[PDB]
């Protein structure tokens, strides 16, 4: 008899999710989902960011995440956290570049 913490408590996410052809930015779709699970979302990739949700984004974002050891996760990671109702290991659903 105890209620769970917000699923993505303490996650501070920057979202860069584009269509493959680069014409459409879907970052708002995923910002909303993250906030509903208790993450904070930053409009900029600043020093407080812990996670970058990345799909077909900018190479500079990829390289900066790698340099800083910020977790680079796919939109599938977001889905799988929602499905599990739990903060799933980021190693399971890495982003691809
Ligand atoms: Cl896990």
Swiss-Prot record:
Tissue expr: Expressed in fetal brain, liver and kidney.
Residue span, BRCT domain: 3-95
Signal peptide from the UniProt entry: none
Subcellular location: Cytoplasm, Cytoskeleton, Microtubule organizing center, Centrosome
Transmembrane segment boundaries: none
Subunit structure, as described in the record: Interacts with CDC27 and maybe other components of the APC/C complex. Interacts with histone variant H2AX under DNA damage conditions.
Disease: Microcephaly 1, primary, autosomal recessive: A disease defined as a head circumference more than 3 standard deviations below the age-related mean. Brain weight is markedly reduced and the cerebral cortex is disproportionately small. Despite this marked reduction in size, the gyral pattern is relatively well preserved, with no major abnormality in cortical architecture. Affected individuals have mild to severe intellectual disability. Primary microcephaly is further defined by the absence of other syndromic features or significant neurological deficits due to degenerative brain disorder.
Additional note from the record: MCPH1 deficient cells exhibit a delay in post-mitotic chromosome decondensation.
Main function: Implicated in chromosome condensation and DNA damage induced cellular responses. May play a role in neurogenesis and regulation of the size of the cerebral cortex.
Domain notes: BRCT domain 1 is required to prevent abnormal chromosome condensation. It binds directly to the SWI-SNF chromatin remodeling complex. BRCT domains 2 and 3 recognize phosphoserine/phosphothreonine marks on proteins with high selectivity, and mediate interaction with phosphorylated CDC27. They also mediate the dual recognition of phosphoserine and phosphotyrosine in the C-terminal tail of histone H2AX.
Protein name: Microcephalin
Span covered, complete protein: 1 to 95 of 835
């Amino acid at each position: 008899g105890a209620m769970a913490a917000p699923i993505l408590k303490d996650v501070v996410a920057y979202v860069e999710v584009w269509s493959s052809n680069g014409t459409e930015n879907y970052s708002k779709t995923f910002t909303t989902q993250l906030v509903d699970m208790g993450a904070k979302v930053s409009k900029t990739f600043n020093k407080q960011v812990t996670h970058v949700i990345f799909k077909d984004g900018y190479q500079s974002t990829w390289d900066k995440a790698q340099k800083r050891g910020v977790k680079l996760v796919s939109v599938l990671w977001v889905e799988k956290c929602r499905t599990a109702g739990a903060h799933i290991d980021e190693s399971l659903f890495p982003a691809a570049n």
